[PDB]
Amino acid sequence: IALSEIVSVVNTSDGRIEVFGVGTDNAVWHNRQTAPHSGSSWTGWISLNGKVTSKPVVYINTDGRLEVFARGTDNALWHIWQTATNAGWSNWQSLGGTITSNPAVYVNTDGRIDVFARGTDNALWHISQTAAHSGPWSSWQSLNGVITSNPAVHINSDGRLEVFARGTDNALWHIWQTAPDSNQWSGWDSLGGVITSDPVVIGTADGRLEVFARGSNNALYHIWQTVPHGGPWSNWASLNGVITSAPAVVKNSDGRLEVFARGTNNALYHIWQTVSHSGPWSNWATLNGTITSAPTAVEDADGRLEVFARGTDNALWNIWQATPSWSAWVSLKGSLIDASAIK
Amino acid sequence: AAIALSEIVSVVNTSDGRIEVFGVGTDNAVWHNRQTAPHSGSSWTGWISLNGKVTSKPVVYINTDGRLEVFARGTDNALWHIWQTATNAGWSNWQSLGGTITSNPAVYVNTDGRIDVFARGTDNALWHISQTAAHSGPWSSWQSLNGVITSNPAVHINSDGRLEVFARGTDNALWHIWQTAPDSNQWSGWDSLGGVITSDPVVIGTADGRLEVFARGSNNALYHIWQTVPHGGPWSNWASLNGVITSAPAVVKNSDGRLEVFARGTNNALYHIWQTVSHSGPWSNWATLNGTITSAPTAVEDADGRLEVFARGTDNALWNIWQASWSAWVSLKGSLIDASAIK
Ligand SMILES: CO[C@@H]1[C@@H](O)[C@@H](O)O[C@H](CO)[C@H]1O
Ligand SMILES: CO[C@@H]1[C@@H](O)[C@@H](O)O[C@H](CO)[C@H]1O
Ligand SMILES: CO[C@@H]1[C@@H](O)[C@@H](O)O[C@H](CO)[C@H]1O
Ligand SMILES: CO[C@@H]1[C@@H](O)[C@H](O)O[C@H](CO)[C@H]1O
Ligand SMILES: CO[C@@H]1[C@@H](O)[C@H](O)O[C@H](CO)[C@H]1O
Ligand SMILES: CO[C@@H]1[C@@H](O)[C@H](O)O[C@H](CO)[C@H]1O
Ligand SMILES: CO[C@@H]1[C@@H](O)[C@H](O)O[C@H](CO)[C@H]1O
Ligand SMILES: CO[C@@H]1[C@@H](O)[C@H](O)O[C@H](CO)[C@H]1O
Numbered sequence: 001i002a003l004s005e006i007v008s009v010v011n012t013s014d015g016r017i018e019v020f021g022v023g024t025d026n027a028v029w030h031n032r033q034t035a036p037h038s039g040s041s042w043t044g045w046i047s048l049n050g051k052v053t054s055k056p057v058v059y060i061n062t063d064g065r066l067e068v069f070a071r072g073t074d075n076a077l078w079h080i081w082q083t084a085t086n087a088g089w090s091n092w093q094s095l096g097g098t099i100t101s102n103p104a105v106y107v108n109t110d111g112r113i114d115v116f117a118r119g120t121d122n123a124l125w126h127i128s129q130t131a132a133h134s135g136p137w138s139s140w141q142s143l144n145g146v147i148t149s150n151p152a153v154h155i156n157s158d159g160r161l162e163v164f165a166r167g168t169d170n171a172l173w174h175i176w177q178t179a180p181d182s183n184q185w186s187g188w189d190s191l192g193g194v195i196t197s198d199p200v201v202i203g204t205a206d207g208r209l210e211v212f213a214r215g216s217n218n219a220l221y222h223i224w225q226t227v228p229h230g231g232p233w234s235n236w237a238s239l240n241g242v243i244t245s246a247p248a249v250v251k252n253s254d255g256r257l258e259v260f261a262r263g264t265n266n267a268l269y270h271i272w273q274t275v276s277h278s279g280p281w282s283n284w285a286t287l288n289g290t291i292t293s294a295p296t297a298v299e300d301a302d303g304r305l306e307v308f309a310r311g312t313d314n315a316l317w318n319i320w321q322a323t324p325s326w327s328a329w330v331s332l333k334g335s336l337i338d339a340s341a342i343k
Numbered sequence: 344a345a346i347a348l349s350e351i352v353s354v355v356n357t358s359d360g361r362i363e364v365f366g367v368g369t370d371n372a373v374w375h376n377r378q379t380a381p382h383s384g385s386s387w388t389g390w391i392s393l394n395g396k397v398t399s400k401p402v403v404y405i406n407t408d409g410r411l412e413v414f415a416r417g418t419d420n421a422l423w424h425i426w427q428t429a430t431n432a433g434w435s436n437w438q439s440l441g442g443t444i445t446s447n448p449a450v451y452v453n454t455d456g457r458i459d460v461f462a463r464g465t466d467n468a469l470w471h472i473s474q475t476a477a478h479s480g481p482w483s484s485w486q487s488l489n490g491v492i493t494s495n496p497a498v499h500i501n502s503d504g505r506l507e508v509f510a511r512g513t514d515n516a517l518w519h520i521w522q523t524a525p526d527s528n529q530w531s532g533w534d535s536l537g538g539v540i541t542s543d544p545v546v547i548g549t550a551d552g553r554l555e556v557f558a559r560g561s562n563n564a565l566y567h568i569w570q571t572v573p574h575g576g577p578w579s580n581w582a583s584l585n586g587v588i589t590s591a592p593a594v595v596k597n598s599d600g601r602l603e604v605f606a607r608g609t610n611n612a613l614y615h616i617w618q619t620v621s622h623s624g625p626w627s628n629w630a631t632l633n634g635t636i637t638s639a640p641t642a643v644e645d646a647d648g649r650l651e652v653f654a655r656g657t658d659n660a661l662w663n664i665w666q667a668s669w670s671a672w673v674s675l676k677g678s679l680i681d682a683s684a685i686k
């Protein structure tokens with residue numbers, strides 16, 4: 001499993017990027033832009049306390065309230081939420097269970113968050129809100145399977161959640177909701193390949209799921225639905241390169257996909273669709289630096305990509321999509337650890 | 344009192360990234376036209392009838408499962424609707440939601456996936472009716488939100504999930520009312536935002552999570568007013584953006600968050616005005632886009648991140664221009680009528 005992303009990132013409801021990581025005290029810390037623009041100053045790192053043993057995973061409820069999910073020291077899923085959009089936070093609360101991966105989080109079309117995690121039996125399990133952006137939560141339910149990566153979730157363009165994970169054969173496997181908002185899922189299906197990172201999944205501008213993962217030769221590979229919210233899936237295709245972290249995928253403001261990963265010189269690299277969201281991929285290009293995590297990418301309120309990665313000083317560093325060339329790297333300070341539950 | 348010439352179509356971005364437009368043909372049926380490809384300058388399906396007989400502007404909205412749904416007043420003065428049975432698939436029959444309505448419908452979705460529809464009653468109060476479950480029937484009863492209004496209503500969601508409706512009052516000021524909490528059937532009382540408006544209000548959410556309203560004023564200039572705090576008060580003073588506009592204004596965000604407004608001028612050309620530099624920047628001068636139009640423009644961002652504008656032409660066809668120097672005007676053919684229920 002290629003070096004993990006070390007923060008969870010969200011666009012707040014007021015257009016500010018907020019990042020969540022694990023400090024050297026195993027607490028969750030967060031940092032937010034002071035202004036909704038590229039190159040904004042930051043609040044500085046502020047602790048949400050807790051003691052976690054996974055990557056913390058933020059998700060925005062449909063009412064704009066942020067909510068963070070993490071594995072606790074008792075192996076349960078814990079969460080903490082804003083009591084009002086972009087306002088104060090709750091205490092940490094346990095959702096129980098015994099989990100063995102990072103959480104994977106998405107929201108159903110009815111506003112109910114669904115959380116996925118590997119169990120003690122290596123199966124995929126999930127637990128959900130029973131009302132829009134609200135408790136009470138459901139019981140934990142097994143979706144079976146036997147998985148060997150962190151799971152990744154995204155919604156189809158018809159409202160059906162879908163989960164991706166590496167299997168016992170190191171192939172990519174997936175499972176999907178049969179209908180929006182449903183607790184009834186499909187059987188597991190193999191998409192084959194041999195993957196050497198967690199998978200990441202995104203929705204294309206034209207309503208198809210597309211998955212990226214590192215392959216056996218450390219190249220970047222991808223595979224996609226060929227019909228909106230449906231099959232068949234494509235064959236795997238190589239995007240070449242040699243990468244030494246998990247890949248991070250994001251959509252530009254114009255729909256063009258762009259992928260970030262660490263290279264074999266420990267620098268940040270990227271590759272992008274050219275011309276349009278239907279266009280052919282660029283060559284790989286360096287964004288320099290010396291990074292000690294996978295990168296994390298998000299679009300800011302100015303429509304520009306922003307990238308975060310740990311530096312050799314263990315601070316979080318930032319670089320963004322200025323024109324004609326990307327910005328200088330700038331430090332957000334902090335000291336972050338990789339608490340990913342599967343590495 | 345005067346209501347500026349209405350938009351001729353309702354527009355939506357489909358779940359597969361294609362612009363779809365809905366208007367009223369010379370037979371009083373609703374017709375739609377869709378891009379064949381999710382790109383600027385795409386060819387179109389051509390106009391296809393959804394039948395019905397309507398006496399309002401038709402209003403499309405996308406359900407949280409991707410299914411389009413159109414709302415319009417019928418020749419019986421009731422609210423009618425028609426929906427896709429699956430995302431971008433076939434349509435239902437038209438079905439009545441009853442009532443007697445005296446405005447165009449205003450439509451939005453709650454944070455729990457329930458569509459909420461607002462219309463003026465024969466008592467000139469604002470009424471509403473909603474889905475009782477996410478993207479699903481049954482529908483609620485018609486319920487009054489009181490007030491006395493003299494324009495078509497406009498609705499948008501706050502950045503904290505609370506719906507908010509805007510309408511002109513008996514005193515020609517802009518008035519508004521808001522949900523007390525997300526998903527609620529409990530609304531505030533009506534509050535005055537003052538001014539003197541000679542159009543329906545047009546409302547948008549800013550890149551930084553504030554509502555902003557545009558309207559024509561008594562001197563036919565474009566005016567706007569905004570929340571000064573995300574999802575809260577106080578509202579700003581009214582500010583003039585000058586011009587002489589002979590239609591309703593159309594407001595949209597660029598891919599970078601910059602607001603941009605389109606309106607017809609005294610020579611019946613299309614004009615526009617935009618924020619410069621960023622979504623926090625000052626406004627440009629008005630500039631012409633030429634053409635000769637017989638409706639207000641309608642503006643939407645396409646899947647390539649470019650603004651697309653539609654307006655009825657001298658030949659009653661729908662004409663298109665897009666943010667390429669802008670493209671040449673091109674005809675999408677058709678023959679449309681202005682069925683707006685308040686003119
Ligand atoms: C979520 O963080 C902590 C959790 O891992 C566990 O140690 O229980 C604590 C409360 O007792 C939580 O604060
Ligand atoms: C999701 O957490 C647990 C799972 O890993 C397994 O140990 O079975 C338990 C139920 O018996 C679950 O609560
Ligand atoms: C869009 O505006 C005009 C249209 O209404 C029609 O008169 O045809 C002209 C081109 O011939 C266009 O400029
Ligand atoms: C206020 O709503 C929060 C909700 O966001 C959380 O998932 O679950 C909490 C308790 O389970 C709720 O109280
Ligand atoms: C995805 O979960 C497992 C997979 O890991 C195994 O290789 O193959 C199994 C099917 O026999 C799947 O259920
Ligand atoms: C994603 O799986 C790929 C496979 O598609 C390729 O043929 O062979 C690759 C070897 O690098 C595998 O890792
Ligand atoms: C129902 O649509 C599902 C789709 O969600 C999945 O990605 O791929 C499946 C085919 O492997 C499809 O049958
Ligand atoms: C076409 O735009 C690409 C952009 O997507 C990439 O981030 O950065 C490249 C170099 O600035 C640009 O050429």
Ligand SMILES: CO[C@@H]1[C@@H](O)[C@H](O)O[C@H](CO)[C@H]1O
Pocket residue numbers: 022023024025029045046333334335336
């Ligand atoms: C998030 O990084 C924090 C930093 O903000 C704090 O000052 O010091 C902590 C201990 O070094 C760090 O883990």
Ligand SMILES: CO[C@@H]1[C@@H](O)[C@H](O)O[C@H](CO)[C@H]1O
Pocket residue numbers: 394395396397416417418419423437438
């Ligand atoms: C929306 O069009 C409807 C039509 O579907 C219905 O049959 O008849 C109505 C008149 O009663 C029409 O207004």
Ligand SMILES: CO[C@@H]1[C@@H](O)[C@H](O)O[C@H](CO)[C@H]1O
Pocket residue numbers: 406410412426428474478479480481482
């Ligand atoms: C399939 O869901 C549709 C819904 O979109 C419509 O609002 O209302 C219809 C009638 O209740 C529903 O059946």
Ligand SMILES: CO[C@@H]1[C@@H](O)[C@H](O)O[C@H](CO)[C@H]1O
Pocket residue numbers: 489490491492511512513514515518533
């Ligand atoms: C919004 O509805 C009405 C308004 O039309 C009237 O001018 O003033 C009333 C209060 O005096 C409002 O409640």
Ligand SMILES: CO[C@@H]1[C@@H](O)[C@H](O)O[C@H](CO)[C@H]1O
Pocket residue numbers: 501505507521534554570574575576577578
């Ligand atoms: C509760 O927040 C509401 C806001 O939604 C409305 O726009 O403006 C009101 C003040 O006029 C606020 O009190």
Ligand SMILES: CO[C@@H]1[C@@H](O)[C@H](O)O[C@H](CO)[C@H]1O
Pocket residue numbers: 597601603617619620650666668669
């Ligand atoms: C700064 O971008 C603006 C654009 O928003 C407007 O559509 O058209 C203007 C003229 O092309 C541009 O200068």
Ligand SMILES: CO[C@@H]1[C@@H](O)[C@H](O)O[C@H](CO)[C@H]1O
Pocket residue numbers: 367368369370374390391676677678679
């Ligand atoms: C939407 O415009 C339609 C057009 O497509 C049809 O051919 O002819 C109808 C009658 O002119 C028009 O109203």
Ligand code: NA
Pocket residue numbers: 084503574
């Ligand atoms: Na609130």
Ligand code: NA
Pocket residue numbers: 562563564585586587
């Ligand atoms: Na004027």
